[PDB]
Design a protein around this ligand. Structure first.
Ligand code: ATP
Ligand code: ADP
Ligand code: ADP
Ligand code: MG
Ligand code: MG
Ligand code: MG
Lengths: 48, 62, 188, 467, 498, 469
């Protein structure tokens, strides 16, 4: 049982990481840059 | 927390795998070959006894 | 000894020592801008193929090299500081690393006029409006009077997001690092 | 990518890439050579320069020559199609029999097995050699090390072990000859071809050979142990089989390093050795373990410089072995062969819970009597053997009888001496030493035990001496 | 089904926070040492991290660059990489959560079995306790070997040294000491429980696996930590494993508990330190070891203290293991560590092969505490045994008169009494019984080849028939007159009946 | 002045000053440390940088940390208020008892006394130890050495001397523990508290302690000797009184000097030692002297690495000592304790005109008989004792009796031997050895003389041995 658990674990791991690396190519630039610039502004506000 | 698009992305991929896990998807022949290899090795290291139930004894007195 | 005025950014090595000497010499007498311009000039003057070929040969005596450099400096009407610096580099045989000295002084003067080099890395290019808000926020990071020197490279190796370097400060909102973080923590 | 050579010093080449730098251990190809010259990267020097070690002769490299990044470390062909072949550092066949056709390549720089993969099983491997089997019993799946100076019997012993163990072995086998004579490799190749262990015209070959012999530069000797390690790792992990891995001579792997370390601008260690001696030895030697995925029974011949066991190289190797076998030049000068020193040789499975109680008791009795004789030797040498009590004379006689009896005639030495090779099953060894220890054979001449098989052959020899 | 559920449970909790962190660019990486440029506020011996999640220590602070040593493999670090300072001196997890766990030099679980639940971290490079906190060593550290518990006793807070050649039985003594503590840890009182830490430096993973399975078989991982920095672990890890283990033991001694730590070996930590120092370009010293090679060990073995009752009363014993070359105790690291430690336990190959196992050379083995840190029964009996062996060793080189013949007889009987097996440590009262039988002229009648048979049979007989007497000796902690009379009659009866 | 750390490598810190530099040997204080970290300047590297050795751990130092220049070398508190206390190299107390409240601070670096201040008078110091008093007698105001490897009795012997001389000594006393086990420091603290030389209640303490134990970085071990030496120097001069000064070991001073030399840019010397070994040791051992203003009796324990008396450190130390007592392992194996080697120990006052003709003749007779015994031992290894000239057996018997009679039980080694400590007055030792040589005891067995005080105790022990025979 333990070997099945861990091996299905690893297969899970690889499958998911692939799927995400294909997905991340998606069109989210404008929104991502907006949120990241917001994060930069917040980090600057804490900085000083 | 609803903002980490990759957080929800990974959760989504996980959910899809959960739904599609009727049989190990993208298993390939390597899945079966490994499974067989290490099951065989475990079978040796444990033993060849009657792999359903309790084997009997028929001990011997002194 | 003479209490030299230290440069803002410490450059180290042979070029560092020569450039720090030049910066200390110029800072008193207040000739930093003119001497930097003269350094940029000699950056091309020595680069001339004839002069470069005549200065990278160690079999022309140091006497001839110093004489030629004195003639060039006189023909270019330089400050005594730059002429003496070139003479000093020639006597010590340090001409092969003269461009290193000019680069060091350029780095040292840029910080003097308040500049913090910056780097931005993304999977793809950016729209000028987004770059404008980036300029604004990054200027928010800086202090008063500290001009910014942005550089926007494009690295497709990362899967998205953004990476920002401001001096030694670093913020990594890139897809790749977050994928790595989740994969590792989840693997544990 | 594309860089240009900037420096070429010995076997160490500096390459400057203006575009993307190659990672470490990554291999590069020098473009413009008659043959394939591979440069393994080793350092990043700053200023977009990488120092590299050349896997072949560097004569003819011109400053400014072009080097092309390959993107992956040295990848060699692995599979069941590398059996019966001969390979070199970079996986190129050198038997002149055609390209090694495999569908799967292995990088030679993999990492060692993790901790959750080790196997704790400890069996005994019977080699048919009295001294090895009695005092330093080799274990199946463990590491074995034959320490010995020059010309004491390392290769003869390892060939005897090849013969015995790998004739009775159903699994595969891999001989990596790193830094040894080329004619020895040729003799091994032809002995296997004759002995059926290699079929040039079939697919029933059970030995894969790799060869980085002494004639090759330091960069090839350094990284040829890793090629054999990879060929064996495949047969262990993937094929899930039990492999034999003979290495001869592993000292030449560390020695070669100290040849390039000097040129890599590293401060030398205790005796001219690279500062990274133990780390490199560890990373090489922890890939030869028997994990849960399979088994590797590695036998390594180790050369002791100037017969100095205090040297950093053998002294460091000692900590990476289950069983050791310290061949000694003095014993070889006495005529004993194999020259195994019964007191330096050790083993992990010399435990009454593994070998038994008669085996353990006999081994300890032999060692005790030999140690007593060693203690007496200094006085015996000057005062003479007349200033000894009777118990001491009995100890001397028994110890000499035992010393002679540990000698054995190998089959690989049939050509040398004309004797007949002998195998001595474990029970016969234990029984014979029991009898000698008890004193059953105090009436025989000590030269009746010299180079015999089981003890009954010693008795027959003694009878023949009477005539 | 639930496998993926528990997989998700891990993602559900992540590290969203991205902070503005100081950094540096790797000017040059090679041989395991990086030369970072930047990190203007990085501290000395601080922990930094690389772009691939790989850690390192900033060991050199030069004006132009920071020399960083990588705690792991080095092929993954390129030039122009990014090094982020974590702003924390190197520290390791500590607590009872680590017991029974195999961990690497940095406190990462190595046997699977999930993560460590440690709630506290401790800096590896902490100063040793002052002069005032300590108190003279009082309790005995029960090792289980007769020859160590009788002739070279070890207290709690002492720093013994096990020094010998290769394959003389040093790790065996360490494992026997670890296993013996099972009887005390199973009991009730917490003043005797001793938690054991085993630092395995430079040992191949197979050896540590054998050791861990051996401890598991003896059910001794309930209270043992194993900090393994094996041969394939980069030198910065083998250099730091002793300090990590010593911090894990400092936690115990600082929280009123008792700990035992076993560095194995220190002669390999010295080699790893030498490699580090030579690759940072620091000038070499004698035998190429850096100048600070004594300090390396002195600062490490000085943390094995015995706190007074105001500071908890906890203690931390240390048993460093050194390896000499052909018995050359006069070498560099052996002499350093011998002049650092309190006692010594000399194992000799000439004794190992002559049949004396453990090979402890009682002639040279020393223990400064000596009298103190020994139970009263053992103190009574081992004293006479020590005198008898001391006299025997003088007249031993040969082999007439009745007096000296009987002296040799008694010496030999005691010698064969001290032998022992592997992973079978004895309770102190049992050792007292055996040594009392041997030293009171009882075995002088028997042959010396049969003494092992006696020892074993006598132990088996007493452990069942006379459990009450052993309990009396343990509880009262001395051979009272009535206990002595009993012992006398038991031995007299058993000797004839055998 | 204010400077700025620019490099940290091991225990060596490079500090840059924008204003005027501080002179060599000055103490600098690092700003931003929870505890007190003091660096000591060791070199001027030019470009306004100064190299320094840190007197404490250099962990958590940041390139750029500001540094203050105290303007003077390390100044320790000195006076009668330091008695009964404990101190660091930098003089702060480590006995957890409060600040040392003195009016005088003394810098730990000073010039040695000039040649016009040397006292030239010697008179035996009777310690109560048979071997020391007979063969290598000490002297008031003289420097004593205790050579020997590890595990031979250096610490036990020095503790025994503190037990005898210091307890019944009117003047003050100082103990500087240099690079030794901290366990031993605590043991000494508690033993002194028990005896009464350190009184935690009143102001009647007679001992001042300074500790630089082996957990400290090399900078502190290389200077704790100077701190103890400064305390002793003050008690010598201002108090104008006799002083004792015990050091253990004075080899850790040299060794700690060797652990930083390579990082200060010096090429090493004969065996991984700093090029300045002899000069560095001389500039310290030359302040431990009996000038005409005071008198320091200095006892020094000197580790001999691997029993090698020809190592550069002990070899150099030999020339700075009046008396030496070379403890030997080959004699400690035999059970003769203290293991002082009678043939390898010497004293300056060991002349017939300082001790007397009887004392001198007894000592020389003992040494000659022991040397003859050594010569005979080679022959006995071949012949055997049964084949010696009936006169030689007499020499061997006398030599063994004398070898055993030099052993003595200390009052501090009760735990090991279990016996009771004996103090033997000088006349009794001379009488005992003169009688043993003269043959007045050639019938008592050897073991009667083992671990006893005066000779009459040997007679009594022999009587007891005979009665229970
Ligand atoms: N008391 C004993 N009785 C019998 N055999 C022993 C005893 N102690 C040790 N041995 C034997 O000695 C061998 C080496 O033991 P051990 O590993 O303890 O020594 P070591 O010096 O630590 O080895 P290494 O230094 O190579 O790791 C073991 O195989 C064991 O069988
Ligand atoms: N079984 C044996 N019988 C006789 N001689 C042997 C035997 N084994 C080794 N030798 C001796 O060893 C020599 C070969 O040494 P070898 O092992 O080839 O050198 P190396 O130690 O460099 O491998 C032979 O000349 C032979 O005299
Ligand atoms: N006077 C003595 N009598 C008996 N044993 C002693 C005596 N002096 C030292 N020893 C032995 O030496 C050990 C202590 O040695 P010590 O002097 O502390 O070491 P070092 O001299 O190397 O500092 C003790 O364990 C003890 O057995
Ligand atoms: Mg050979
Ligand atoms: Mg071991
Ligand atoms: Mg001492």
């Amino acid at each position: 049982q333990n070997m099945m658990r861990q091996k299905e674990q690893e297969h899970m791991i690889n499958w998911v990481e692939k799927r995400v690396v294909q997905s991340i190519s998606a069109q989210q630039e404008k929104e991502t840059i907006a949120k990241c610039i917001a994060d930069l502004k917040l980090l600057s506000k804490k900085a000083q | 927390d609803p903002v980490q698009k990759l957080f929800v992305d990974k959760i989504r991929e996980y959910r899809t795998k959960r739904q599609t896990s009727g049989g190990p998807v993208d298993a390939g022949p390597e899945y079966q070959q490994d499974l067989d290899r290490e099951l065989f090795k475990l079978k040796q290291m444990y033993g060849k006894a009657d792999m359903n139930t309790f084997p009997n004894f028929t001990f011997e007195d002194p | 000894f003479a209490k030299l005025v230290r440069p803002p950014v410490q450059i180290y090595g042979i070029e560092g020592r020569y450039a720090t000497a030049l910066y200390s010499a110029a800072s008193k007498q207040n000739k930093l801008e003119q001497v930097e311009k003269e350094l940029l000039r000699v950056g091309q003057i020595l680069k001339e193929p004839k002069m470069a070929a005549s200065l990278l040969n160690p079999y022309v005596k140091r006497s001839v090299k110093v004489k030629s450099l004195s003639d060039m400096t006189a023909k270019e009407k330089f400050s005594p500081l730059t002429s003496n610096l070139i003479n000093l580099l020639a006597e010590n045989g340090r001409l092969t690393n003269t461009p290193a000295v000019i680069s060091a002084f350029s780095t040292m003067m840029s910080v003097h006029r308040g500049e913090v080099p910056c780097t931005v890395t993304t999977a793809s290019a950016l729209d000028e409006a987004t770059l404008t808000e980036l300029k604004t926020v990054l200027k928010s990071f800086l202090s008063k009077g500290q001009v910014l020197k942005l550089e926007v490279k494009i690295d497709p190796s990362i899967m998205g997001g953004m990476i920002v370097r401001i001096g030694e400060k670093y913020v990594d909102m890139s897809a790749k690092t977050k994928i790595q973080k989740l994969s590792r923590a989840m693997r544990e | 990518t594309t860089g240009r050579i900037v420096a070429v010093i010995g076997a160490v080449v500096d390459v400057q890439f203006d575009e993307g730098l190659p990672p470490i251990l990554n291999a590069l190809e020098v473009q413009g050579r008659e043959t394939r010259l591979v440069l393994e990267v080793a350092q990043h020097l700053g200023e977009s320069t990488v120092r590299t070690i050349a896997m072949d002769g560097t004569e003819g490299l011109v400053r400014g020559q072009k080097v092309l990044d390959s993107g992956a470390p040295i990848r060699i062909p692995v599979g069941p199609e590398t059996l019966g072949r001969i390979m070199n550092v970079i996986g190129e066949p050198i038997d002149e029999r055609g390209p090694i056709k495999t569908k799967q390549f292995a990088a030679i720089h993999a990492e060692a097995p993790e901790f959750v993969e080790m196997s704790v099983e400890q069996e005994i491997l019977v080699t048919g050699i009295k001294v090895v089997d009695l005092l330093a019993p080799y274990a199946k799946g463990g590491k074995i090390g034959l320490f010995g100076g020059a010309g004491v019997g390392k290769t003869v012993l390892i060939m005897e072990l090849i013969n015995n163990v790998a004739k009775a072995h159903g699994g595969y086998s891999v001989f990596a000859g790193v830094g040894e004579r080329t004619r020895e490799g040729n003799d091994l190749y032809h002995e296997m071809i004759e002995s059926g262990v290699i079929n040039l015209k079939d697919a029933t070959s059970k030995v894969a050979l790799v060869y980085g012999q002494m004639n090759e530069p330091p960069g090839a000797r350094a990284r040829v142990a890793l090629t054999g390690l990879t060929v064996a790792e495949y047969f262990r992990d993937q094929e899930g089989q039990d492999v034999l891995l003979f290495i001869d001579n592993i000292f030449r792997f560390t020695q070669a390093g100290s040849e390039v370390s000097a040129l890599l601008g590293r401060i030398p260690s205790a005796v001219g050795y690279q500062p990274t001696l133990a780390t490199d030895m560890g990373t090489m030697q922890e890939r030869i373990t028997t994990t849960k995925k399979g088994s590797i029974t590695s036998v390594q011949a180790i050369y002791v410089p100037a017969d100095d066991l205090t040297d950093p190289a053998p002294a460091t190797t000692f900590a990476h072995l289950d069983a050791t076998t310290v061949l000694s030049r003095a014993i070889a000068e006495l005529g004993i062969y194999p020259a195994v020193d019964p007191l330096d040789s050790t083993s992990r499975i010399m435990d009454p819970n593994i070998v038994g109680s008669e085996h353990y008791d006999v081994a300890r009795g032999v060692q005790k009597i030999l140690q007593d004789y060693k203690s007496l030797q200094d006085i015996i040498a000057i005062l003479g053997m007349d200033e000894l009590s009777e118990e001491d004379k009995l100890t001397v006689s028994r110890a000499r009888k035992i010393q002679r009896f540990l000698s054995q005639p190998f089959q690989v030495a049939e050509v040398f001496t004309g004797h007949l090779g002998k195998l001595v099953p474990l029970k016969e060894t234990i029984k014979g030493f029991q009898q000698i220890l008890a004193g059953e054979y105090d009436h025989l001449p000590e030269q009746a035990f010299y180079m015999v098989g089981p003890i009954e052959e010693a008795v027959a020899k003694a009878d023949k001496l009477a005539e | 089904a639930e496998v993926s559920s528990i997989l998700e449970e891990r993602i559900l909790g992540a590290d969203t926070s991205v902070d503005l962190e100081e950094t540096g660019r790797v000017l040059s990486i090679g041989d395991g040492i990086a030369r970072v440029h930047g990190l203007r506020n990085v501290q000395a011996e601080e922990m930094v991290e690389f772009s691939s999640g790989l850690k390192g220590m900033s060991l050199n602070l030069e004006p132009d660059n920071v020399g960083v040593v990588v705690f792991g493999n080095d092929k993954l670090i390129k030039e122009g990489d990014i090094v982020k300072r974590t702003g924390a001196i190197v520290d390791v997890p500590v607590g009872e959560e680590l017991l029974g766990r195999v961990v690497d030099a940095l406190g990462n679980a190595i046997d699977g079995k999930g993560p460590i639940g440690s709630k506290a971290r401790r800096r590896v490079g902490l100063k040793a306790p002052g002069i005032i906190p300590r108190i003279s060593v009082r309790e005995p550290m029960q090792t289980g070997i007769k020859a160590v518990d009788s002739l070279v006793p070890i207290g709690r807070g002492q720093r013994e040294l096990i020094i010998g050649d290769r394959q003389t039985g040093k790790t065996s003594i360490a494992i026997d000491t670890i296993i013996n503590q099972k009887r005390f840890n199973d009991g009730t009182d917490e003043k005797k429980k001793l938690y054991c830490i085993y630092v395995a430096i430079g040992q191949k993973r197979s050896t540590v696996a054998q050791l861990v399975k051996r401890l598991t078989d003896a059910d001794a991982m309930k209270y043992t930590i194993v900090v393994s920095a094996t041969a394939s672990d980069a030198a910065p890890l083998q250099y730091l494993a002793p300090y990590s283990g010593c911090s894990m033991g400092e936690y115990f001694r600082d929280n009123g508990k008792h700990a035992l730590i076993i560095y194995d070996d220190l002669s390999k930590q010295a080699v790893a330190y030498r490699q580090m120092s030579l690759l940072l370009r620091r000038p070499p010293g004698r035998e190429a070891y850096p100048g600070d090679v004594f300090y390396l060990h002195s600062r490490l073995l000085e943390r094995a203290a015995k706190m007074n009752d105001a500071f908890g009363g906890g203690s931390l014993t240390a048993l460093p293991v050194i390896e000499t070359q052909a018995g050359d105790v006069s070498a560099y690291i052996p002499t350093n560590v011998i002049s650092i430690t309190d006692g010594q336990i000399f194992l000799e190959t000439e004794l190992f092969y002559k049949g004396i196992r453990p090979a402890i050379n009682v002639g040279l083995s020393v223990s400064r505490v000596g009298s103190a840190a020994q139970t009263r029964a053992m103190k009574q009996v081992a004293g006479t045994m020590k005198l008898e062996l001391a006299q025997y060793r003088e007249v031993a080189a040969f082999a007439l008169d009745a007096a000296t013949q009987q002296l040799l007889s008694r010496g030999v009987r005691l010698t064969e009494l001290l032998k022992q097996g592997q992973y079978s440590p004895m309770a102190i009262e049992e050792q007292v019984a055996v040594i009392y039988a041997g030293v009171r002229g009882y075995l002088d009648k028997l042959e010396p080849s049969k003494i092992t048979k006696f020892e074993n049979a006598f132990l088996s007989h007493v452990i069942s028939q006379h459990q009450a007497l052993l309990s009396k000796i343990r509880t009262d902690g001395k051979i009272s007159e009535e206990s002595d009379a009993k012992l006398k009659e038991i031995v007299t009866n058993f000797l004839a009946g055998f």
